[PDB]
Amino acid sequence: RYYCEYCHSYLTHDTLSVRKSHLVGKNHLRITADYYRNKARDIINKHNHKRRHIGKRGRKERENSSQNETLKVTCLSNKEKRHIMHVKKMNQKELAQTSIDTLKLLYDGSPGYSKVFVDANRFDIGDLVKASSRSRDETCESNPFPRLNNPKKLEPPKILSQWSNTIPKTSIFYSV
Amino acid sequence: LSRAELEELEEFEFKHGPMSLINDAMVTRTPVIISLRNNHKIIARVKAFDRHCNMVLENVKELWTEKKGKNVINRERFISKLFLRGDSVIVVLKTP
Amino acid sequence: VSTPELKKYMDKKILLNINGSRKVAGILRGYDIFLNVVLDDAMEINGEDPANNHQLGLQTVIRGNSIISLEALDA
Amino acid sequence: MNYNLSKYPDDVSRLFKPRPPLSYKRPTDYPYAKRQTNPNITGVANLLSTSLKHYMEEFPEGSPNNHLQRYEDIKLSKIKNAQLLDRRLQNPNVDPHIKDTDPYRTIFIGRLPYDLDEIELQKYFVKFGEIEKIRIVKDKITQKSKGYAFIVFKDPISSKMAFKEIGVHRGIQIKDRICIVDIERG
Amino acid sequence: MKLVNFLKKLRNEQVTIELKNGTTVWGTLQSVSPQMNAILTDVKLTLPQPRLNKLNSNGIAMASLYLTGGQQPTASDNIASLQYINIRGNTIRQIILPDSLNLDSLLVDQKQLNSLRRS
Amino acid sequence: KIQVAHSSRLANLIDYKLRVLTQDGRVYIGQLMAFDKHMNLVLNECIEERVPKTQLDKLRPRTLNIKVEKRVLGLTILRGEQILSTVVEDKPLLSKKERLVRDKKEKKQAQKQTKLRKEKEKKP
Amino acid sequence: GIPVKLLNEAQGHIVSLELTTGATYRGKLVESEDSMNVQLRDVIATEPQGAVTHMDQIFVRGSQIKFIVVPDLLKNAPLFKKNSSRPMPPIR
RNA sequence: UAAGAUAUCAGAGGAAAGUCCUCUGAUCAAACAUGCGCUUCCAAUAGUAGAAGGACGUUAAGCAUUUAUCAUUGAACUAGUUCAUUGAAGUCAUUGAUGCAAACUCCUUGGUCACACACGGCGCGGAAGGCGUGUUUGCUGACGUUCCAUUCCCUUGUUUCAAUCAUUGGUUAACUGAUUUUUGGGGCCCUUUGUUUCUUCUGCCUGGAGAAGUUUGACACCAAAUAUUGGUGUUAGGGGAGCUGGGGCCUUUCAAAAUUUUGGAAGGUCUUGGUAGGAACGGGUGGAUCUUAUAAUUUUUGAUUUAU
C-alpha cells in the first residue's frame, strides 16, 4: 500500500495516477507548503539553550569585583514582554521582504529595459518563466522624450521610526 | 515454477552441465588450476562450490608474477584453507 | 521495472556521451526500460567541428550501459 | 531565487536555499575512458602445467571429503528404505487373514477407534445388509488394534451401499472416531 | 544452495579478508550478511609491498588507507589499525580462513539435508 | 578513541558520525540518517576528503603530515555501488539514556495525534 | 528505502550531482524515478578537467550517479521520524 | 515487482513413509534487570590557564617553484627565430595553481563535582565499551473486542549560622537529638540574557514574589482567503510517603546429600529500579527481517592495483 505522510492519510484507490493526482492536489500542496513553514521557524524560535559550567571563582577576582559597584538590571512585565516579542518578531519578517529594487526603477525608459529587467523574456531565465505585458519588441521610438508629464519623482530615502527625531527639523532651501 | 522445481534444476546443472567439471573435480579428489581476473593463478583442491562459482579450497598455492620495465619475478604464497569469491574467476581447468 | 520518461524528448536533436570520450548526436526515435536508445541521422562529434566529425548510418541503436548523460539540444 | 518552477508559492520556494556551488577539485582517480581491469592475463600455461608436479608430489593424497559422507549416509539409507519395502511387496492372496469370500463383497473400514469391538462394527455395518464375515485387523507384532477391518457382505450391492453411506458420509462415527469406508483395494 | 550460508557459521574467528584493491584486513569477524557484507572488529588493514626494486604500489588504496583515520603518524611501513570496519561484499576477493576449524562439520548445509530428509 | 558496540550493525548506529570510503579514494565523513538493502546512505553534514596527487608520494613507505583538500557538501544521498567500506568516527550528541527518553516522549506524542485526528474525523 | 524516497522529496529544488566520470551538474531537479535517474532543468555542468558550460535540459542514467547533494531543510522531513503512528487503513 | 516465511536442533506424544501439531532438553537471538577491587574517559582558580576538534580565518602579492593556445599563407633570417594576415576551438584565474613553514585571532565540546595541600587504589556520579548470571520473549508496533487496572504530599535561587515559636523521643521543671513556622546575619548563583525557559495572568535588581491549571485537556506559535479551517510544538525538573520489581546479606523453619553444601518459605537490614497502564482474544492491519524468483545492461557475483 501507499500513503502521504504530510497529509497522514492513505490513498483510497491505489494506482500510479491517483498518486500523481494526490501529489499535485490542491489540498496536499497546502499541507506541504505549511509543513515546511513550521519547521523553518522552529529551528529559529527554539533557540539553543546552552548548558553552563560554573568554575569556582578565585580569591583574587572576588575582591576586585567586590569593590566594583553592582549595576542595575531592567526586567519588563509579562504584559510588556508579550508585546515587545510580538513587535520584534514582526520586524524580522519585514527584513525578509525588503528586496531593495531601486535600480530597476531607475532604468525604466532605457534602450534594453525590456530585454534585461522584465525577466519573462531574458535568455537565461526567459524560457523557464513562460511555463510558470511589456514585450521584447519595444524600441526607443515610443516615448522619445521621457519628461513630458510622464515621469514620477524619485521616492525619498527611508528612515528608522525609533530614531525619527534625530532628523534636522528645517530644510536648507524652500521646496514647493 | 515452484520451489521444488528449482531444486531439481540446480541438481541437474551441477551434475550434467558446464559446472560438472567442478563437481567431478570435488568428488574425485583431483586438483584444479584457477585463473582469477587478478592475473594470478592458484593451484588447489576443491572442497565445496556454488551457483555463483565461489568455492572453498584447501591446500592453496597461489602463483603471482609482476613486472616493472621488463624486470620479472615469480612469487609463490602458500595458504592452508581459503574462501574464494566467484566473480574473480575466468577459467577453471581440471588437471589430468 | 519502470520505463524512463523521455516522452517529451523524442524527435528532437540530442547529444549524448558514449562511455567516456565519444559523443554522438542524432534525432531520437525510441527508447526502452534499460535505456538502450535508437536515433536517426547520427554523427560522431569530435574536437574539430567539420573535420573529424563523420556520419555513422541511417539508423543506429545504442546500448544503455554506455549512456552517461543525454542532453536535449532543442526546445 | 527568481523563477522557482515548483508546486510551492514564492515564499516557501525561497525557503529551500541550497548551499553554494561545490568547489572544484582536480581529480585523483583514473579517467572513465582509461578505466579497465587488469588486461594481459597470461593463460594457464604449459609451463604452469609443468610446475604442477611440484604441487602434486607435495600433496599426493587429497584430504577426505567427510561432509560428503553425511550425504552418502542419507542417500544410501533411502535406498535401503526401498529394500525393506521390497521385502513387504512380495508377501494379499496369502495373508491368511484376508482370504474368505468374494473380494467384491468386501468393505474396507478404516480409522476405526482402537477401542471399538467387532460387535459395534457388526452393528453399524449390518445397517447396510446381512454380514457373512468381519475381521478387525490387529498388529501381528503385538495386538494393538490397527484401526482397520474387512467386512464381507452376502451381496456386493449391499457392500457398495454400505460403502456409499458410511464412508462418503464424512466417515461413520463409531464410538468417538470418524471411520472412512472404502472397497477392499488390496 | 548459498555458500554465503557457510560464512555465517564462521562467527568469532580470526580471519583475513583480502580485497579487490589489494588491501588485506586481519581481524575478528562478526555477522556476515546474505550479500557477504563482512563486519569485523579488532582489525589491522595493510598493503603488501610488491618489491621488484620500487614498483609503485596501489595508488588509490594508499589514499583510502590514510583516510580511514586509523593510520598512526609513526607507522613506518604501510599499515593502519582501528576498531570496527564494515565492508561491502562485492569488494571481497578472497577470505583466508584459519587452520584450526574443521570444514566437515561446517560445510554440511542444513537446507541441503532438510530437502533430502523431507522428501 | 571511540569504542563501538562489538556486535552493532549499520541499523544500530544512526546519528554516529561515520567515515565512509568510496572506490576512488575519497571519504565522506558525516552523521548517518538512513540506509538501504543495497547499502546507499544519507549523511547529514558530510565533508569529502581527498588526498591530492602531489601529496601521494608522501604516503609511500620510507611524523607525516598530509594536506587533505576537503570540501563541504551538506546532506548528501550517496550511492551503494560506490561504497567500499565504513568506519566509525564520533558518537552521537545525545546520550544512550537520553535517546530512549526522546523515543518514549515521541512515541507518546505520535499516538496522541491519531486519536485526536480519528475523533476529529469521526463526528465531523 | 529512504535514500531514494528522499530524492522524490527534492523535486523542483536546486540539487547537485557528481557522475562517476567525475563531472558535476547543478541545476533544478524536475524528475526522478525509482532507479535514482534524474532530469535536471537549467543546469551548470562542470567537466572533470574544470571546464564549465550551461545546458537547458539534461538526462542522466542513474547508474552513473556518485552522490546527490540536496537542500539542507529536508534534513527534517518526515521520512526520518523513527516512531510514526499511521492510522488504520480504509478497506478495499 | 511478486510469492512464500517469522530461530535452529534433538528427543516423547497425537492425526513402514513423510507432513502437520504439542510438551521436554540443548544451542542461538532480542529486550529488560543486575553484578563484577573489570576496561577507558570526564579542564587553571593556591589561577588570567589548558585538552580535543575546527576555521569553507588572518598574516599574505609570505617564502620556494612551474605554468598561459593550434593550423594555414608572405617577409626577413641562421642552415631553428621574429613580424603581419586567414581559420579552428577557448572554466575562471597568474594578487593564480603546486610544494614549505610558522605566528596570531576566533569558533564548538566538557563534572570546569566532593574531600584533601597531605613523602605503585578500593569517595559520590555521568559517558563509553568488554565480560557473567537471572527473568521475560521468540520479528515488532499501532487498532478493535471482554477483562484486569484504580494512589498522594511538599518544593522551582541555593546553602549556612544565629535568634525565637511549635511538634515528637531520651533521662533526671532542666538538658540533649530530629523536624516545622517568623526574623536577622553570612556564603555562593541569577546568561534565568522573553531575569526560572512546566504553562497562562500579575510582577521584579533597595529582589528570588503572588494568583489560577495540568492530557479525550490547556497553552504557544505558523498559514491563509474573506470569526473560522488546516499544520508544528510544549505539557518539565527535584525531594519525600505509598505501592511494587531486581540485587547482596543476616536469623529462623523445612527437603536431599555426606557439623557442612544445595533448594524452598518467612522476618530483619543494606542497595537499586519502576510507579499508569497491563492480559487475553480478534482481524482481506502497518512496518522489520529472512528464502526464492534475482549471477543477463540501473547498486551485491567484478572493466579503476594502468599494466602489453
Numbering used by the authors:
A (entry chain B): 3 to 134, 153 to 196
B (entry chain M): 13 to 108
C (entry chain Q): 2 to 76
D (entry chain A): 1 to 91, 94 to 188
E (entry chain L): 1 to 119
F (entry chain K): 3 to 64, 72 to 133
G (entry chain N): 5 to 96
What does the paper say about this structure?
U1 snRNP, the most abundant snRNP in most eukaryotes, is critical for the initial recognition of 5ʹ-splice site (ss) through the base pairing between a single-stranded region at the 5ʹ-end of U1 snRNA and the 5ʹ-ss. Specifically, while purified human U1 snRNP (~250 kD) contains only ten proteins (seven Sm proteins, U1-70K, U1A, U1C), purified yeast U1 snRNP (~800 kD) contains seven additional stably associated proteins (Luc7, Nam8, Prp39, Prp40, Prp42, Snu56, and Snu71). Here, we report the structure of yeast U1 snRNP at 3.6 Å resolution determined by cryo electron microscopy (cryoEM). The modeled yeast U1 snRNP has a dimension of ~200 × 120 × 80 Å with the overall shape resembling a foot in three dimensions.
Most secondary structural elements are well defined and a large percentage of amino-acid side chains and RNA bases are identifiable. We built atomic models for almost all essential domains of U1 snRNA (excluding the 5ʹ-end 10 nt of 5ʹ-ss recognition sequence and ~230 nt non-essential region) and partial or complete models for 15 of the 17 proteins. The U1 core (Sm ring, U1-70K, U1C, U1A, and U1 snRNA) is located in the “ball-and-toes” region while all modeled auxiliary U1 snRNP proteins are located in the “arch-and-heel” region. The yeast U1 snRNA structure overlaps with its human counterpart in the LR1, LR2, SL1, and Sm-binding site regions, while the SL2, SL3, and 3ʹ-tail regions are drastically different between the two RNAs. Our yeast U1 snRNP structure demonstrates that the core components common between yeast and human are organized almost identically, in spite of the dramatically larger yeast U1 snRNP. Although the yeast SL2 and SL3 regions are almost three and 15 times the size of their human counterparts, SL2 forms a 90° bend in the middle and SL3 is largely peripheral, enabling the U1 core proteins to bind at similar spatial positions as their human counterparts. Prp42 (544 residues) is a central component of yeast U1 snRNP that interacts with all visible auxiliary proteins, and connects them to the U1 core in the “ball-and-toes” region. In addition to interacting with all visible auxiliary proteins (Prp39, Nam8, Snu56, Luc7), Prp42 interacts extensively with the U1C-CTD. The C-terminal TPR domains of Prp42 and Prp39 interact extensively, both using the face made of helix A, to form a heterodimer-like structure (left). The C-terminal half of Nam8 (the linker between RRM2 and RRM3, RRM3, and the C-terminal tail) can be modeled into the cryoEM density and is nestled between the Prp42/Prp39 paralogs. Snu56, therefore, acts like a “clamp” which uses its C-terminal helix and KH domains to clamp the RRM3 domain of Nam8 onto Prp42.
